Amino acid sequence: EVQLVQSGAEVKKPGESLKISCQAFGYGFINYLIEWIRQMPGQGLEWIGLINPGSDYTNYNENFKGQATLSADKSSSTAYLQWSSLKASDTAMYFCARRFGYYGSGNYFDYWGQGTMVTVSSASTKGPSVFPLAPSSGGTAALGCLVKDYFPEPVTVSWNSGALTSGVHTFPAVLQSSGLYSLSSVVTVPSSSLGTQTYICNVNHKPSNTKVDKRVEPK
Amino acid sequence: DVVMTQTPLSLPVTPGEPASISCTSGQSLVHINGNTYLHWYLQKPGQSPKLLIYKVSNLFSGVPDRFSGSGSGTDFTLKISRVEAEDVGVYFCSQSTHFPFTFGQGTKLEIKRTVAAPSVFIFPPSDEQLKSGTASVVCLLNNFYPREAKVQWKVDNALQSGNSQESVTEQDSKDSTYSLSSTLTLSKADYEKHKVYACEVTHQGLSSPVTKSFNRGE
Numbered sequence: 001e002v003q004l005v006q007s008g009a010e011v012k013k014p015g016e017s018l019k020i021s022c023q024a025f026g027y028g029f030i031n032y033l034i035e036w037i038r039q040m041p042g043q044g045l046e047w048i049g050l051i052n053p054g055s056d057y058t059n060y061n062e063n064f065k066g067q068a069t070l071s072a073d074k075s076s077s078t079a080y081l082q083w084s085s086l087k088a089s090d091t092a093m094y095f096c097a098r099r100f101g102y103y104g105s106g107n108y109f110d111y112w113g114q115g116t117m118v119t120v121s122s123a124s125t126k127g128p129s130v131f132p133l134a135p136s137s138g139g140t141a142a143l144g145c146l147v148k149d150y151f152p153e154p155v156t157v158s159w160n161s162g163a164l165t166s167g168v169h170t171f172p173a174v175l176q177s178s179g180l181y182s183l184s185s186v187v188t189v190p191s192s193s194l195g196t197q198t199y200i201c202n203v204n205h206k207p208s209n210t211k212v213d214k215r216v217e218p219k
Numbered sequence: 220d221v222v223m224t225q226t227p228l229s230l231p232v233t234p235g236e237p238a239s240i241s242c243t244s245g246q247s248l249v250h251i252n253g254n255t256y257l258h259w260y261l262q263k264p265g266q267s268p269k270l271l272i273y274k275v276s277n278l279f280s281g282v283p284d285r286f287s288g289s290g291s292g293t294d295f296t297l298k299i300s301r302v303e304a305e306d307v308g309v310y311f312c313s314q315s316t317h318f319p320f321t322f323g324q325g326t327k328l329e330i331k332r333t334v335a336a337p338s339v340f341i342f343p344p345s346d347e348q349l350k351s352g353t354a355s356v357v358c359l360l361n362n363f364y365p366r367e368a369k370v371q372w373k374v375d376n377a378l379q380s381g382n383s384q385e386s387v388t389e390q391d392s393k394d395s396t397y398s399l400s401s402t403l404t405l406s407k408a409d410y411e412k413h414k415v416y417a418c419e420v421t422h423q424g425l426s427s428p429v430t431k432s433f434n435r436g437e
């Protein structure tokens with residue numbers, strides 16, 4: 001087995017620069033061909049570049065020469081991606097990968113790092129506000145929580161401390177014009193249970209150390 | 220840059236049926252060395268792509284033989300002889316003949332099921348939110364199929380635009396339905412000077428558009 005481990009998720013402002021790492025665990029780093037590929041959420045794959053740590057060889061996507069610098073330290077088997085003058089539209093999941101060997105080698109690999117999430121935005125770390133989506137009018141009822149105005153991603157949401165998962169839908173976040181994120185989490189339950197069962201949503205936004213439990217009651 | 224064009228963009232499949240994904244390159248993928256470096260990947264949500272097939276027709280280790288690849292020059296096809304639930308996700312063609320390496324935009328493969336109408340629910344803003352200075356009205360379309368759904372907001376019968384946002388869940392693994400939330404966002408001020416807030420839903424499983432309303436303050 002070979003494995004690629006990338007550095008942690010980055011949050012930057014427009015105009016700033018980043019440097020993300022991709023560490024290799026294997027024999028013969030110097031004959032690797034390491035690629036970098038990014039993916040905006042919901043979007044396609046964009047090829048950035050390829051590097052051969054054992055030579056001077058880099059190949060770049062012309063659209064990114066000027067922002068992107070590929071490099072590698074042979075002593076630590078780590079490859080690097082530098083990106084200057086970040087733009088909001090550079091927000092993406094960034095992967096390193098080892099897919100090929102030299103042409104003619106017969107080699108085909110499928111080694112991908114776990115990806116490094118890069119968020120480029122002019123906004124500042126902020127915990128969410130949690131508002132209830134209350135049920136109303138022996139069939140089935142719906143209820144939820146609104147998780148509003150937080151930054152950056154992600155947030156996690158559970159119901160009754162994880163004891164409820166059936167009928168739960170936790171929607172993907174949407175970026176508001178404020179630069180803050182907003183999502184709902186909902187759940188459908190029998191309307192006969194509305195007087196008996198307590199419903200609490202557990203919203204956890206690590207980046208700001210916010211942890212909130214909101215009780216969701218009728219009326 | 221060698222442009223790679225995938226069709227169809229979206230492919231609903233019924234477990235048991237054969238599927239077919241097409242990739243066209245804007246220029247020949249035959250290398251000067253004679254080989255054709257066209258590869259197929261499958262990416263499941265929140266995961267990275269996995270190699271399925273390399274150089275047109277070769278199965279990557281571990282990949283079952285119900286997957287086959289074919290084609291030549293500029294024209295390539297991925298076939299699944301009998302689809303399964305596990306085959307769901309986004310398929311990308313990838314070329315490594317010419318620099319810069321390029322990818323097609325993806326074909327989404329989803330499970331095809333019988334038409335299911337949404338259950339629609341509407342939630343007025345909370346008292347708690349109103350104290351904050353803002354009003355978010357939320358419309359929920361629940362466990363429906365297929366994805367094509369029209370949600371329109373009506374405030375005192377005036378059609379709204381540009382003040383709502385939608386998001387949609389991934390296809391549910393056990394029932395194959397989608398769910399959707401539409402959020403109308405207003406200022407407390409703009410909110411309070413209207414009475415009827417209405418969510419109107421159009422979808423293939425509804426004989427006619429369904430509205431869910433509240434008159435502010437109940």
Ligand SMILES: CCCCC/C=C\C/C=C\CCCCCCCC(=O)OC[C@@H](O)COP(=O)(O)O
Nearest residue numbers: 052057100101102103104105106107254256315
């Ligand atoms: C240390 C001395 C360096 C040797 C000089 C050789 C190459 C120059 C350095 C880097 C260029 C790497 C670019 C190669 C891109 C390869 C892309 C690719 O589809 O691989 C396919 C190969 O794994 C296998 O091919 P085949 O045997 O099936 O034909």
